[PDB]
Symmetry: C2
Subunit: 407 residues, 2 copies
């Protein structure tokens, strides 16, 4: 009838248990001979290990109607082949059975690691943290779809913000990681649980402990990347409301987008994460479903913001003429703004024509715009410096700030 | 006394001359045995080939007090080893002398290219354009300093926006490119000329022809990248005016920055390009001269904008605690804004305390902020769609837009 996912959890507060379990689970996921449902179970096990009570979190947060989770209390055991068994009796086969040229095996890149069992908290958290990181990054990879900028951006980020919290000794093989990549690809359950986690971590009062905090970070990245193209296109393509929207060739897209926006809205407070949950959703909300309007919006965007740097239209359905069209619309819009402003002040059309021209040119010359921005900011900054020289600073303020930099 | 740079230019309108000259010059730059000054000459030759009269442009735009340019009118010749000679007589040695296991040689990656001489305009422009591109990209590389995101970003950009204008058949070896990299590194003259070009292309009335346009693009990229870190730091580090600026450990930096801003200002309309002209300037204006305040400003920035995606603090002097400090300042500033607003409306401090808390939390939860932004935009977009359904569109507008998309 209903699908059960077995998920192992620690059976006592001790770190040795927690740790040995983590070890055996990592070990288990690397086994080439393990079945999907089991793997998923093990992963939800591992994903839950960063709270004092994994089983609790799992119980309260799981939100999948098609499956039922059977938690499995695990404890130490000097008598089993594994260092572990269940409660409660003589279920040490269950235990050993459960964990059954060591080359077909996923493990760590560093072959000098023999095990990741550990008796201290701080040390358990480095291992757990480092592993959890790689794991969540995989998800991000899946969600950022074509873009390759994140196996980069995000590993880089984690590298520089988490140290000495994310450590290289505990980098696992591609072979190991691919199992996880795969389970994420193939299992709606696992994905539901990960989204649930995201939500839980978000809704936490605190006081986020290091690992929670970093996972939270990855999460934010994923969420903004998920629907980037979409929002980009709406923001610079539709909302600008340039005459080019009337062109016959946007007609079909605008309506797709209308569908996408209505769908988006109908999804309520879940709307952002949906591209994580089903890939088809992510593919349908992708730029590919309205490539022209997107290219246009790209143009409009970079024209409008004078930026550039960070954009990425390195894609197959990117049409550069639509980029140029967007840009030109932006220019002509400037022209219009200026002729309008001009006429209000009490100037004639004859005389406003030229104003329109010059405005368009003003928009066009982006080097000058940059120059102006820079100059502007430099002026501002000198102003602030001067100001601080003057009325310097309440020692109270400095005291609170010190009190800040402390923690 | 004064240093002369010999720079060859075409001696007639014909494309065969222009083309053969380009060929011999490329050929010449690849010669491992050529001297610096000569190479620079040849490069300024090649850089000028995209206007109807290279010599004119060179004459009017060169702005270097320490050197004097001797243009050299070149024309075809069925009698020299080269297909070229000078005016005006019997200076065909000058000519041949000038161009004197072919492995030590820079040339094209594609060994199937025998020569790039050509009799048509459209075809000369593909070669010239493709070469000029690689050239200007090198400069960009030099100016973007540590960042490696541009040998990427910018080649990608040029790839996708210029096609079929920038062609792979005409990719030159690293070996060839390195000569140019080197001359740019070692010669203030060449750099002055390139900046002059930048200015000229900027100041052009038009109607920018393809090649001009693309070079212009590269230029804009370079200019905004040049002082990014700097403006970033001023914008989010100083201008925000958070109490943390009072900390003893920013004291020394703020004053460096003050110096940098004063210097910047003193440089007038040249101020942006100066980081191109001397590397020491670029190094001094780099993040390395005020690393903490920069890290802080990074934090403040991503906290403030909820972005993320495109940032790059992958650097050695990046201090993440200062990032966190920046962030926290942003939060506390939110808190403050809200307590203030609260008290104006007629609320007590007791009651405003909590308001401050909640505001801080509002700032902190960035996933929620994202969510709100997305939702907001979706609403906006549906609104626009609805609006367009209603009062659709002046056919006149559509007509002008059509008239646009045409060109």
């Amino acid at each position: 009838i209903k699908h059960i996912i077995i998920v192992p959890i620690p059976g006592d507060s001790s770190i040795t248990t927690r740790s040995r379990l983590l070890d055996r689970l990592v070990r288990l996921i690397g086994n080439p001979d393990v079945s999907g449902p089991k793997l998923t179970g093990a992963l939800i096990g591992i994903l839950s290990l960063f709270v004092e009570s994994p089983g609790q979190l799992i119980q309260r947060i799981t939100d999948d109607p098609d499956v039922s989770i059977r938690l499995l209390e695990v404890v130490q055991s000097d008598q089993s082949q594994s260092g572990l068994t269940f409660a409660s009796t003589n279920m040490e086969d269950e235990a050993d059975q459960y964990f059954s040229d060591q080359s077909r095996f996923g493990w760590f890149e560093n072959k000098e690691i023999s095990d990741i069992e550990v008796q201290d908290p701080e040390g358990f958290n480095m291992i757990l943290g480092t592993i959890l990181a790689q794991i969540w990054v995989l998800l991000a990879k899946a969600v950022t779809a074509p873009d390759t900028a994140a196996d980069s951006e995000l590993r880089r980020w984690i590298k520089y913000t988490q140290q000495r919290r994310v450590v290289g000794e505990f980098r696992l093989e591609r072979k190991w990681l691919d199992v996880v990549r795969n389970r994420i690809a193939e299992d709606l359950s696992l994905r539901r649980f990960m989204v649930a986690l995201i939500l839980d971590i978000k809704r936490t009062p605190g006081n986020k402990p290091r690992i929670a905090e970093m996972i939270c970070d990855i999460d934010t990245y994923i969420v903004e990347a998920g629907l980037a193209s979409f929002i980009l296109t709406i923001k610079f393509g539709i909302e600008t409301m340039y005459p080019a929207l009337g062109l016959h060739e946007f007609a079909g897209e605008l309506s797709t987008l209308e569908s996408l926006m209505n769908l988006y809205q109908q999804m309520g407070e879940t709307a952002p994460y949906m591209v994580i949950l089903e890939n088809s959703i992510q593919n349908k909300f992708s730029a590919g479903s309205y490539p022209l309007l997107w290219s246009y919006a790209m143009g409009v965007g970079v024209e409008l913001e004078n930026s550039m740097g960070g954009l990425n239209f390195g894609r197959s359905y990117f049409d550069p003429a639509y980029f140029r069209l967007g840009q030109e619309m932006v220019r002509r819009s400037a022209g219009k703004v200026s002729s309008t402003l001009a006429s209000e002040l009490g100037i004639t059309a004859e005389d406003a024509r030229l104003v329109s021209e010059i405005a368009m040119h003003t928009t066009e010359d982006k080097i000058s715009r940059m120059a102006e921005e820079q100059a502007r900011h430099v002026k501002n900054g000198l102003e602030c410096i001067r100001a601080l020289k003057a009325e310097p600073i309440g020692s109270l303020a400095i005291e609170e700030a010190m009190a800040a930099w402390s923690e």
